[PDB]
Amino acid sequence: GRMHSAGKGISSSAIPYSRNAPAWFKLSSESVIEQIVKYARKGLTPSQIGVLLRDAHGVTQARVITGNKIMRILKSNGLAPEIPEDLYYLIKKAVSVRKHLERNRKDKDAKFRLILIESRIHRLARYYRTVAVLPPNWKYESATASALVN
Amino acid sequence: APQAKILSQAPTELELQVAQAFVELENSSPELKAELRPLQFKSIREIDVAGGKKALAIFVPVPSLAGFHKVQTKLTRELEKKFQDRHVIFLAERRILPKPSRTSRQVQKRPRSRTLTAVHDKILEDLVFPTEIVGKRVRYLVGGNKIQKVLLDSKDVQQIDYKLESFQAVYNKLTGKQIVFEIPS
Amino acid sequence: TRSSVLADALNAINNAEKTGKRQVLIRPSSKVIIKFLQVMQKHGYIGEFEYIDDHRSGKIVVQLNGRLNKCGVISPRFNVKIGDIEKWTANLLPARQFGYVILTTSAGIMDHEEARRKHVSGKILGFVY
Amino acid sequence: MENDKGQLVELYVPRKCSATNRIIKADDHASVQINVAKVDEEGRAIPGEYVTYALSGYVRSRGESDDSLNRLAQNDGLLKNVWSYSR
Amino acid sequence: VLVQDLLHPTAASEARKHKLKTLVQGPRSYFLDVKCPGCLNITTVFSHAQTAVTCESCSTILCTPTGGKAKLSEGTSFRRK
RNA sequence: AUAAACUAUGCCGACUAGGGAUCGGGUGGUGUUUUUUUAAUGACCCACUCGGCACCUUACGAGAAAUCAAAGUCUUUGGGUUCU
Ligand SMILES: [Zn+2]
């Protein structure tokens, strides 16, 4: 189930049985690349480039029409973020709870829910240091947490 | 001569026969001068189909299989009429690197595209070229032999519908694995 | 989480022999499950099985023909010296004269009988009868 | 089952269920031996010439006895278009 | 029951199953070609789109996101391709 | 940081049986109703599905029994792991 709750939901995307673009697509394998980097220069994460491309430009998913994953295109173009967006959105949520809990510290549930979020930050930053995505120590600090999100 | 610039260095007489079949369309040239000029191939193997026909396998260097796929359907028509009793198919000359044993070491880690189980999958994707494969099943019989089953897309199937008997012979000669093709509706 | 897919597959088969079914569907599938089913097939314990190709891991549908009492897994895969095999066949086989213990030797996955005539040994996977 | 000289032992060989291929024990009193008449032109069921099916008491308790005979008799030509493989 | 064709289930049963519980999982969504009244250009829209998709020209509205399929707005002809 | 802190039933994973209700989300209907003439939503009906709190009937199975769809898949004894 979920890591930090008892929910057992299975809701998920379902990739089709095809490693080729659909026959109706016929834009290019390269004009999509320019449209990938056009959104990235607007400061868009890979998660929200894909939802933007699928909803409007009709790409099913960017691997089957290019061969590359989206942030491999960004990293090849030099638009990779400093920290992953997977870890960035966990830190931003931790700063949001810390700011909230700073002024009304009678929430025993926001103190509980903060611990779950910070534990998830440490588990994920442990993985990133191992695969050399993050610098070898990098030491997520709460006092400097708000600096990284902005 | 532009006939000899397609084959490797010398061989062979059969490579010239297909070479003349290209220049009769390059010199006719409704639109083909813009796309059939750079397209070149490497070799022909002749495979005896279990019927009265035979099969022609065209091997492509594969920076250019995408280029060949533009004129694939049209060019096969102008190869089957001037070569009777034949079935023409286009394949890519892929490289298979051997699996490293605990003694047979190497340098340069072997990419997954060079594995044999991935090359044989790319043969089935390239034998049939239209009618994208919509599934695969493998039967492990009681006796002990394995029979694959390739499920093909129902649309545009009338371009290869007669060639299912030929394809099972070609894939057997290159892989040694049985194939049945089934068309779901 | 899923710790071993071989245990799930053999649990699925064993539950459907008890209920009376003539087929199972197991998911996922691996080379170990394929070889274990191939050893079961050549001794006549199961019928034909078909491997459905997903792009993920695949599923298997296995036809059952009665005549199977138990297929089980041994976890952990204990190391078995060549003189310890008759200590396992005595433990978890119903008689000395039918039934097989499937091992994993460097000569491949095989039952205990022709691990003996090949004179190899290794780790234990399970048993069928 | 036999000895070295091929002489038979095991005082009786048991019946086996024709649906689930399992042994009919000597104390399975819910087991059933179905006898079906063989027929020829103009009806007239031939006496004493049968098509026989055995069902174990496990199957009948589970409620699978009807669906089993529909399969067991359609494959013998006794029925047509009653049992379907694909559910 | 106790004998089934698990390799060839009927199309009705596979249609009434969940998206992941079929024999091979796959998407039940699709893509749509919609004609806004303003211009005549080709716009491809995901059926379960999450962004409020607008045309490249005059950018009004083409669909509104919902918790299910996107609600296509007032009359714009749609194809399914 | 103590409770009959209780479901006196650790947590994760898989399989095995039939049903009718209900909570939240979703899909479908040449359905009902609300009025503008139906429309758009909303409420409702029918069918399906995912995820929940539960319940009813049986017992292939388990148990010392009471009873239990898990307390089953256990002398045919081995899915992973913590505590007692
Ligand atoms: Zn517009």
Return the HEC string of A97-143.
HHHHHHHCCCCHHHHHHHHHHHHHHHHHHHHHHHCCCCCCCCCCCCC
How is B80-118 classified by DSSP, letter by letter?
Answer: HTTSTTEEEEEEE----PPPP-SSS--SS---GGGSHHH
Count the alpha carbons within 13 Å of B36 in the hemisphere toward its beta carbon.
21
Query: Can you give the distance from the CA of residue E74 to the C1' of nucleotide F40 in angstroms?
Result: 10
Enumerate the residues of chain C whose CB falls inside 8 A of the CB of residue B182: none
Distance from residue A62's CA to the centre of ligand 1 (Å): 25
Task: Decide if A120 is inside a domain.
Answer: yes
Enumerate the residues of chain C whose CB falls inside 8 A of the CB of residue D58: 20
Instruction: Report which residue type is found at A88.
Output: Y
Q: What phi, psi does E32 have (nearest 5°)? A: -125, 140
- Nucleotide nearest C8, from its CA to each C1': F14
User: Domain locations in chain C?
Assistant: 1-68, 69-129
E42/A contact by beta carbon, under 8 A: no
Q: Which domain holds residue D18?
A: 1-87
Name the packing angle between helices B116-127 and B164-175 (round to 10°). Answer: 160
Closest Cα in chain C, distance from residue D58 (Å): 9
Enumerate the residues of chain A whose CB falls inside 8 A of the CB of residue E28: 14
Whether residue A76 is found in the same domain as residue A108: no
Note whether B132 contacts A20, CB cutoff 8 Å: yes
Instruction: Kindly state the tokens that stand for C93.
Output: 């086989």
3-state secondary structure of B44: strand
Q: Single out the residue of B177, B161, B149, B173 nearest to residue B57, CA to CA.
A: B173
Distance from residue E55's CA to the centre of ligand 1 (Å): 4
Nearest to C52 among E2, E3, E24 (CB): E24
Count the alpha carbons within 13 Å of C26 in the hemisphere toward its beta carbon.
27
Q: Single out the residue of D86, D87, D76 nearest to residue D38, CA to CA.
A: D76
Task: Give the resolution in Å.
Answer: 3.0
Closest Cα in chain C, distance from residue E49 (Å): 25
C48/E contact by beta carbon, under 8 A: no
* Rounded-to-integer distance, Cα A117 and Cα B94, Å: 49
- Nucleotide nearest C2, from its CA to each C1': F13
Q: Tokens 């990938």: give the residue.
A: A36
Degrees (nearest 5) of the Cα angle A122, A123, A127? Answer: 110
Give the count of beta carbons closer than 10 Å to the beta carbon of residue B19: 18
Task: Decide if A21 is inside a domain.
Answer: no
3-state secondary structure of D39: coil
* Residues contacting C91, CB < 8 A, separation 6+: none
Any bridge partners for residue D35, and if so which? D52
E63 burial level (CB within 10 Å; 0-12, 13-18, 19+) = buried
**Residue A80 and residue A71 in contact, taking contact as beta carbons nearer than 8 Å:** yes
Distance from residue E67's CA to the centre of ligand 1 (Å): 24
End-to-end distance of chain D based on CA atoms, in angstroms? 40
* Rounded-to-integer distance, Cα C3 and Cα B165, Å: 44
**Residue E4 and residue E51 in contact, taking contact as beta carbons nearer than 8 Å:** no
B156/A contact by beta carbon, under 8 A: no
* Rounded-to-integer distance, Cα C30 and Cα C109, Å: 13
Q: Single out the residue of B154, B148, B164, B163 nearest to residue B184, CA to CA.
A: B154
* Rounded-to-integer distance, Cα A91 and Cα C29, Å: 38
D-B interface (Cβ pairs under 8 Å ≥ 3): no
Per the structure, the count of domains in chain D is 1
- Ligand 1 ion: residues within 5 Å (CB): E 36, 38-39, 55
Q: Tokens 């039952």: give the residue.
A: C111
Distance from residue E57's CA to the centre of ligand 1 (Å): 5
Nearest to B136 among C34, C47, C53 (CB): C53
How is E47-75 classified by DSSP, letter by letter?
Answer: TT--S----SSS---SEE--SSS-EE-SS
**Strand C100-105, strand D32-37: pairing:** unpaired
Name the packing angle between helices C31-42 and C5-19 (round to 10°). Answer: 40
CA torsion through residues C99, C104, C106, C110, sign: positive
3-state secondary structure of C125: strand
Q: Which domain holds residue E23?
A: 1-81
Chains in contact with E, counting 3 or more C-beta pairs less than 8 Å apart as contact: A, C, D
Q: What phi, psi does C101 have (nearest 5°)? A: -110, 120
CA torsion through residues A119, A120, A126, A129, sign: negative
B121/A contact by beta carbon, under 8 A: no
* Residues contacting D8, CB < 8 A, separation 6+: D1, D2
Q: What residues of chain C, 47 to 106, have a C-beta less than 8 Å from chain B?
A: 47-53
Note whether A17 contacts B134, CB cutoff 8 Å: yes
Whether residue A103 is found in the same domain as residue A141: yes
* Rounded-to-integer distance, Cα C16 and Cα C7, Å: 14
C67/D contact by beta carbon, under 8 A: yes
Closest Cα in chain C, distance from residue D80 (Å): 22
Distances in Å between the Cα of E60 and the Cα atoms of B42, D44, E38, E53, E77 are 55, 81, 9, 9, 15
D86/C contact by beta carbon, under 8 A: no
Instruction: Kindly state the tokens that stand for C90.
Output: 């005595």
Per the structure, the count of domains in chain E is 1
Distance from residue E20's CA to the centre of ligand 1 (Å): 36
* Rounded-to-integer distance, Cα E73 and Cα E57, Å: 17
Query: Can you give the distance from the CA of residue A1 to the C1' of nucleotide F9 in angstroms?
Result: 21
**Residue C29 and residue C76 in contact, taking contact as beta carbons nearer than 8 Å:** no
* Rounded-to-integer distance, Cα B43 and Cα D39, Å: 67
**Strand E43-46, strand B133-140: pairing:** unpaired
Buried b (16+ CB within 10 A) or exposed e, B37-54: eebbbbbbeebebeeebe
Q: What is the dihedral of CA A114, A117, A119, A121, to 10 degrees?
A: -130
How is B121-157 classified by DSSP, letter by letter?
Answer: HHHHHHHT-SS-EEEEEEEE-SSS-EEEEEEE-STTG
- Nucleotide nearest C25, from its CA to each C1': F15
D19/E contact by beta carbon, under 8 A: yes
- Nucleotide nearest C124, from its CA to each C1': F78
**Residue D24 and residue D31 in contact, taking contact as beta carbons nearer than 8 Å:** yes
Degrees (nearest 5) of the Cα angle B90, B25, B161? Answer: 40
* Rounded-to-integer distance, Cα C123 and Cα C116, Å: 14
Q: What is the dihedral of CA A51, A54, A60, A66, to 10 degrees?
A: -80
Distance from residue A41's CA to the centre of ligand 1 (Å): 26
Protein residues with beta carbon less than 7 Å from any atom of strand F: A 1, 6-11; C 1-4, 7-8, 11-12, 14-16, 18-19, 69-70, 72-76, 91-92, 94; D 58, 61-62; E 1, 16-18, 21, 66-69
3-state secondary structure of B72: helix
Closest Cα in chain D, distance from residue E25 (Å): 20
**Residue C60 and residue C37 in contact, taking contact as beta carbons nearer than 8 Å:** yes
Whether residue A142 is found in the same domain as residue A120: yes
CA torsion through residues A103, A104, A110, A111, sign: positive
Q: Tokens 């009786």: give the residue.
A: D12
* Residues contacting A52, CB < 8 A, separation 6+: A39, A44, E51
Dmax (CA) of chain D: 53
Nearest to B140 among C49, C52, C53 (CB): C49
Count the alpha carbons within 13 Å of C121 in the hemisphere toward its beta carbon.
10
Nucleotides, chain F, CB distance < 7 Å: 11-18, 25-28, 48-52, 60, 72-74, 76-80
* Rounded-to-integer distance, Cα A51 and Cα A47, Å: 7
- Tell me how long chain C is: 129
Task: Decide if A14 is inside a domain.
Answer: no
Instruction: Kindly state the tokens that stand for D41.
Output: 């032109």
Distance from residue C73's CA to the centre of ligand 1 (Å): 63
Helices and strands (H, E) in chain D, number of each type: 2, 2
**Residue C61 and residue C52 in contact, taking contact as beta carbons nearer than 8 Å:** yes
Enumerate the residues of chain E whose CB falls inside 8 A of the CB of residue A12: 20
**Residue C9 and residue C58 in contact, taking contact as beta carbons nearer than 8 Å:** no
**Residue B71, Ramachandran bin (φ over 0: left; ψ between -120 and 50: alpha; else beta):** alpha
Percent composition of chain D: helix, strand, coil (DSSP 3-state, to 5): 20, 20, 60
Distances in Å between the Cα of B118 and the Cα atoms of A20, B45, B114, B121, C53 are 16, 21, 7, 5, 14
Note whether E81 contacts A10, CB cutoff 8 Å: no
Which method, experimentally, gave rise to this model? cryo-EM
Q: Tokens 């697509």: give the residue.
A: A25
D76/E contact by beta carbon, under 8 A: no
Which residue is nearest nucleotide F17, judged by alpha carbon to C1' distance? D62
